[PDB]
mmCIF file of C-alpha atoms and ligand atoms in Angstrom:
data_model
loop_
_atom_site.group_PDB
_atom_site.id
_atom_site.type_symbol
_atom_site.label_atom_id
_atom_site.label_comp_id
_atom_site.label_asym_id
_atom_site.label_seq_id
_atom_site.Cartn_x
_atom_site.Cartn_y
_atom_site.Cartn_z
ATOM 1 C CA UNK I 1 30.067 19.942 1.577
ATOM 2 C CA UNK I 2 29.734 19.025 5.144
ATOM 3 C CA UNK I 3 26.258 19.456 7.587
ATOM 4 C CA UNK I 4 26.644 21.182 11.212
ATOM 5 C CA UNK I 5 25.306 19.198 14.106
ATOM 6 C CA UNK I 6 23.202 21.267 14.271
ATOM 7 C CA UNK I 7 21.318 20.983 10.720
ATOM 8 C CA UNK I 8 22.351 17.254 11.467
ATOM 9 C CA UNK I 9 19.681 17.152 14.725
ATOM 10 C CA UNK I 10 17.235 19.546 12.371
ATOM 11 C CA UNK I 11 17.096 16.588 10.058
ATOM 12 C CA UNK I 12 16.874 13.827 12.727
ATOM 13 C CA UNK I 13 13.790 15.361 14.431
ATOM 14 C CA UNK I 14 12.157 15.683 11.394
ATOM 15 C CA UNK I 15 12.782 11.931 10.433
ATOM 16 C CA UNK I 16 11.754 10.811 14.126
ATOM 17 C CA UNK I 17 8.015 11.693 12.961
ATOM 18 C CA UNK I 18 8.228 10.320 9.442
ATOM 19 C CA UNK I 19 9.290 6.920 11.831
ATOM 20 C CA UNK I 20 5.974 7.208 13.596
ATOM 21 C CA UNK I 21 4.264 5.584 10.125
ATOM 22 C CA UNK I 22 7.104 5.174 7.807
ATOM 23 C CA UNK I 23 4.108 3.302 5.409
ATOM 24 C CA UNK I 24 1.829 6.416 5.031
ATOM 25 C CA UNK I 25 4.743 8.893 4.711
ATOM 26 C CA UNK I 26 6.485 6.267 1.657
ATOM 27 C CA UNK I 27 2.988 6.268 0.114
ATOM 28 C CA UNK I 28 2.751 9.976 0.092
ATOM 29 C CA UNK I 29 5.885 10.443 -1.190
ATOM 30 C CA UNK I 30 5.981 7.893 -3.997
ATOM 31 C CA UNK I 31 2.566 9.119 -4.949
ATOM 32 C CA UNK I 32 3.689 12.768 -5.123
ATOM 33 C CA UNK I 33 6.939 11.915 -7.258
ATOM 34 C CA UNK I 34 4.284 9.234 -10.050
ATOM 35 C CA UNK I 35 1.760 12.560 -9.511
ATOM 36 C CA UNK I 36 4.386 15.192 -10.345
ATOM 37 C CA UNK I 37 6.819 13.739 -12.615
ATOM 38 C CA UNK I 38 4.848 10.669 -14.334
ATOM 39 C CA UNK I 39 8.163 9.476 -16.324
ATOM 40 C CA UNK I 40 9.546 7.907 -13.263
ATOM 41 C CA UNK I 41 7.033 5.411 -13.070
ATOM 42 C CA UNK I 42 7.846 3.919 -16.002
ATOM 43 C CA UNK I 43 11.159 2.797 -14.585
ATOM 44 C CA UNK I 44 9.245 0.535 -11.847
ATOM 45 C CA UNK I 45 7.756 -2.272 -14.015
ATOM 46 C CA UNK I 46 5.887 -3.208 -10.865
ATOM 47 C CA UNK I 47 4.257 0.182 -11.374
ATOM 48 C CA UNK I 48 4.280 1.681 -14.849
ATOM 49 C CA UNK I 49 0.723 0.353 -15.649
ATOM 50 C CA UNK I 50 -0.785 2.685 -12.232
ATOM 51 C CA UNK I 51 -3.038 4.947 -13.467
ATOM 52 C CA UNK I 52 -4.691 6.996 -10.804
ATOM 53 C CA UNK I 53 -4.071 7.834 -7.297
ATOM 54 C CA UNK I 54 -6.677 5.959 -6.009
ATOM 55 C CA UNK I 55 -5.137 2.556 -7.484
ATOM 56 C CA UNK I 56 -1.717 3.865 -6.272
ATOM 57 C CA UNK I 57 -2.679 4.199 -2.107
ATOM 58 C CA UNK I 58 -4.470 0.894 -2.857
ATOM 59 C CA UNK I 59 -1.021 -0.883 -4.103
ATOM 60 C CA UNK I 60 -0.109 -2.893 -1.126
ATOM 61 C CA UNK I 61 3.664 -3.091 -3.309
ATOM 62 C CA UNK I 62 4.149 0.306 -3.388
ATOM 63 C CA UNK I 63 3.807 0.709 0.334
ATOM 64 C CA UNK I 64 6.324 -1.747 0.390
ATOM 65 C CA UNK I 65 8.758 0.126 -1.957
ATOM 66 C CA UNK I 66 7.940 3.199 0.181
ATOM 67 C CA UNK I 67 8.805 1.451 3.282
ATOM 68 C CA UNK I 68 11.923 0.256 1.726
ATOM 69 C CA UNK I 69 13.362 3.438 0.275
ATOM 70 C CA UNK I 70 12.751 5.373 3.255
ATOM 71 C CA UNK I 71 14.464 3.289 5.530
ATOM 72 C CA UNK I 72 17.135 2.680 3.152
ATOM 73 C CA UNK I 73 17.318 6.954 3.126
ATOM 74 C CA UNK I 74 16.871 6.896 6.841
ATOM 75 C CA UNK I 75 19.686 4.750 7.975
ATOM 76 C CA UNK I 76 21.842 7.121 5.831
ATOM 77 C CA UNK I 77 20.526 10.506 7.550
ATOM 78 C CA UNK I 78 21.819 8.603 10.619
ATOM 79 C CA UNK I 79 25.184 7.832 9.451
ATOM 80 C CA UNK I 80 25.247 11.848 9.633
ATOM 81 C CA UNK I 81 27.480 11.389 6.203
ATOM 82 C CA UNK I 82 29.207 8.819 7.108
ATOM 83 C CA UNK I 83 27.460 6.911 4.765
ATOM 84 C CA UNK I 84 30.214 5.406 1.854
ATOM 85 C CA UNK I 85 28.899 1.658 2.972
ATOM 86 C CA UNK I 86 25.333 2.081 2.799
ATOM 87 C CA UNK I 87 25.710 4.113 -0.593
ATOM 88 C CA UNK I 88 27.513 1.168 -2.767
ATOM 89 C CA UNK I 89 25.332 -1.490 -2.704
ATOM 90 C CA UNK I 90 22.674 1.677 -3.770
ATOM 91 C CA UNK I 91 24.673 3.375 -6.310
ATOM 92 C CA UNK I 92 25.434 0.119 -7.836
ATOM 93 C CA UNK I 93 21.477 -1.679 -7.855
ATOM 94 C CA UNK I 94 20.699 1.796 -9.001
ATOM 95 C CA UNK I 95 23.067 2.642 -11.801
ATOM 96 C CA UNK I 96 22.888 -0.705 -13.412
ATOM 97 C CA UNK I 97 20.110 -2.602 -12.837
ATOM 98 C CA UNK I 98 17.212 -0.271 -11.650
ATOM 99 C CA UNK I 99 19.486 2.745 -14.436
ATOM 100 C CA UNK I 100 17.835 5.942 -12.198
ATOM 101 C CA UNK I 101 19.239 8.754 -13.476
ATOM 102 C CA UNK I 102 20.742 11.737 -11.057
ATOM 103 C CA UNK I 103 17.514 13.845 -12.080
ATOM 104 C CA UNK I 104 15.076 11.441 -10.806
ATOM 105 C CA UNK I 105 16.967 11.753 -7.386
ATOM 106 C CA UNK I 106 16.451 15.371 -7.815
ATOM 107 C CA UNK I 107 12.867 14.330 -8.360
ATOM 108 C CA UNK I 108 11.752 12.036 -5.404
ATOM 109 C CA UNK I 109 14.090 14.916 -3.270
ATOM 110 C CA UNK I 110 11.475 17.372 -4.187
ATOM 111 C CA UNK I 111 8.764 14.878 -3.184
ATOM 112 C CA UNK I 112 10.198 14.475 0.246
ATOM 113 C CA UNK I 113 10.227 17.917 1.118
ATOM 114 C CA UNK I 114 6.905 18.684 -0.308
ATOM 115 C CA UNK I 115 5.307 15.752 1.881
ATOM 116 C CA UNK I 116 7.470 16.966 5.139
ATOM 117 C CA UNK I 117 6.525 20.293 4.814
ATOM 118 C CA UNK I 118 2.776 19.464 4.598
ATOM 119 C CA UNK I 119 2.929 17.183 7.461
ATOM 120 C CA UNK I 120 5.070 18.401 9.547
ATOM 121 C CA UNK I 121 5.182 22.065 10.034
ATOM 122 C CA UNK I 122 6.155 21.491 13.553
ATOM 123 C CA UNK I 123 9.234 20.420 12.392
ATOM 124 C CA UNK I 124 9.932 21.445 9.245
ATOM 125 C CA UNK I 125 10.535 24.746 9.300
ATOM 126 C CA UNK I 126 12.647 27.100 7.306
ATOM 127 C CA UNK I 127 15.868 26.256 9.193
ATOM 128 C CA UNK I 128 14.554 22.477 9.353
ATOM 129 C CA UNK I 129 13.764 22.461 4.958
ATOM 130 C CA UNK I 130 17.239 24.100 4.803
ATOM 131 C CA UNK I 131 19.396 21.481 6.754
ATOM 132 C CA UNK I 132 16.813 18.477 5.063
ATOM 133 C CA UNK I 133 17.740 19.996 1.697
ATOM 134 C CA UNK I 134 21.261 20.008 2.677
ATOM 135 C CA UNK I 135 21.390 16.577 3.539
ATOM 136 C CA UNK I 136 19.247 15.471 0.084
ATOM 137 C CA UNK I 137 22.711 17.263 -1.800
ATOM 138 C CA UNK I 138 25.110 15.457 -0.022
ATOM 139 C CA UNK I 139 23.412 12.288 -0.703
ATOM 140 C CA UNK I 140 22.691 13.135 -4.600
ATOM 141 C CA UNK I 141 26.210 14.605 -4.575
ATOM 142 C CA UNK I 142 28.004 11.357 -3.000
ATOM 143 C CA UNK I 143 26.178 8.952 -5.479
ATOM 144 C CA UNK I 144 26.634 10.949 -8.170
ATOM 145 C CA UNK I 145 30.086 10.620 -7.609
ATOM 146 C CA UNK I 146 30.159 6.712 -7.573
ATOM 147 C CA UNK I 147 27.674 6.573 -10.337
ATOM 148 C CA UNK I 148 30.728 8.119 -12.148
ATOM 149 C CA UNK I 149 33.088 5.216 -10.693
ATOM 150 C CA UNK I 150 30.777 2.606 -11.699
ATOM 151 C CA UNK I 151 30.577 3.995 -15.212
ATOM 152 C CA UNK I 152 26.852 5.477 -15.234
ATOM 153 C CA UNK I 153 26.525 9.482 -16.512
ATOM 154 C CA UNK I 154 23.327 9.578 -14.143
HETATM 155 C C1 HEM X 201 16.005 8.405 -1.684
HETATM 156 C C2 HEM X 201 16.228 7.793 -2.849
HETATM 157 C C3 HEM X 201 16.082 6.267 -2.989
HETATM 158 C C4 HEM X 201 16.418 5.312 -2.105
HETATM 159 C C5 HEM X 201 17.036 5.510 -0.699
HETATM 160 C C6 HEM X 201 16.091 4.025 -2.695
HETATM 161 C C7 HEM X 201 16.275 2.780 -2.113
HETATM 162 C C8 HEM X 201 16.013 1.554 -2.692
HETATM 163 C C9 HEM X 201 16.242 0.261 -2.072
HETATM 164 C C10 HEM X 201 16.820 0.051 -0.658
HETATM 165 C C11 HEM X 201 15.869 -0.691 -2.945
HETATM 166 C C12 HEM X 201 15.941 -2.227 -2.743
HETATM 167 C C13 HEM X 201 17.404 -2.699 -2.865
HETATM 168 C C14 HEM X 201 18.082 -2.231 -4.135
HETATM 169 O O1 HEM X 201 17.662 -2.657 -5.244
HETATM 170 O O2 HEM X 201 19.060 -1.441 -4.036
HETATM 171 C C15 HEM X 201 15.390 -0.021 -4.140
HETATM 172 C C16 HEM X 201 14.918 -0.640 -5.275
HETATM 173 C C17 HEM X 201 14.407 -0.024 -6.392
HETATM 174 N N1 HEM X 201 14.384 1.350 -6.644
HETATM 175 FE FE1 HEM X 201 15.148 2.800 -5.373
HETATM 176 N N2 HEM X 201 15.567 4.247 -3.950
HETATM 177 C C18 HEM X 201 15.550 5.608 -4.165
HETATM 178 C C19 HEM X 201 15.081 6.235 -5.298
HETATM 179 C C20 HEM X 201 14.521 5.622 -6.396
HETATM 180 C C21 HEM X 201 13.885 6.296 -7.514
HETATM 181 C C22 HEM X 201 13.743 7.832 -7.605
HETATM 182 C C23 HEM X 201 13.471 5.356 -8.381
HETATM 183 C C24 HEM X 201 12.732 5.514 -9.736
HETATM 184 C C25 HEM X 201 12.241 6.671 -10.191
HETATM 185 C C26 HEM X 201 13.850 4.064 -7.842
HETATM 186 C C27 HEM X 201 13.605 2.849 -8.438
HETATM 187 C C28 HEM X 201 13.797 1.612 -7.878
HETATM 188 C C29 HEM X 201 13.427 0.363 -8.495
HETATM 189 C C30 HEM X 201 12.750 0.139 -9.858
HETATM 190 C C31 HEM X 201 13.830 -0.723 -7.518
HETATM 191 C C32 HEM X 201 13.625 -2.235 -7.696
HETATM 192 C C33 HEM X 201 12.196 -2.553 -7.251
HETATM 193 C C34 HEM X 201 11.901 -4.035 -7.272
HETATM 194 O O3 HEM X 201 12.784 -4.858 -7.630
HETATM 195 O O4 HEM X 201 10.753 -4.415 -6.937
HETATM 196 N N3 HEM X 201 14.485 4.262 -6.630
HETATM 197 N N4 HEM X 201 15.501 1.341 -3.962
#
């Protein structure tokens, strides 16, 4: 699978907000995947003992980890999927050490779009969900693919 340019820019203008306060945006979106799928917090032992909402936007760590992963995802949006040497050192923290499987990808996916579409309707957008979601598969598909190589199911 390969984006246009064109769902390529769709995706970039969208992330240009999300850079305006990366910090709120991570919270929102970690918070929305611990909210909507409570399983994956039990694979962050910084984290599994969070019990409300409230104690999660007060977690000065979890902004952290938001910060972190959405750089992390935003340096590969900008690689425009030319992304194999940002992906290993990912695949392989995440396979074996961190052991996220494919589905919880899915999972935090989900959460992304759900917080961009609140936030930005500007910019998000039918066209701009469909070229986001696009993007989302390539990355799930390309580490799903070295998962394989390292010797992780996912
Ligand atoms: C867009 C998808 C994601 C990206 C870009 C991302 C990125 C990162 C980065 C850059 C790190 C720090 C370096 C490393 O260990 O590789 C990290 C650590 C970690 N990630 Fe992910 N991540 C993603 C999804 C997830 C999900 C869905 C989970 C669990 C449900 C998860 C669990 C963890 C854990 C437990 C750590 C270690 C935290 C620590 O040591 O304090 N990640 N992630």
């Amino acid at each position: 699978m390969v984006l246009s340019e064109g769902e390529w820019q769709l995706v970039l203008h969208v992330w240009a907000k999300v850079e305006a306060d990366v910090a709120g945006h991570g919270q929102d979106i970690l918070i929305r995947l611990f909210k909507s799928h409570p399983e994956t917090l039990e694979k962050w032992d910084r984290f599994k003992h969070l019990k409300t909402e409230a104690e999660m936007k007060a977690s000065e760590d979890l902004k952290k980890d938001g910060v972190t992963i959405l750089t992390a995802l935003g340096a590969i949006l900008k690689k425009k999927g030319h992304h194999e040497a940002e992906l290993k050192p990912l695949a392989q923290s995440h396979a074996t050490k961190h052991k996220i499987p494919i589905k919880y990808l899915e999972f935090i996916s989900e959460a992304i779009i759900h917080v961009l579409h609140s936030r930005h309707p500007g910019n998000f957008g039918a066209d701009a969900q469909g070229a986001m979601n696009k993007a989302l598969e390539l990355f799930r598909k390309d580490i799903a693919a070295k998962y394989k190589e390292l010797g992780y199911q996912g």
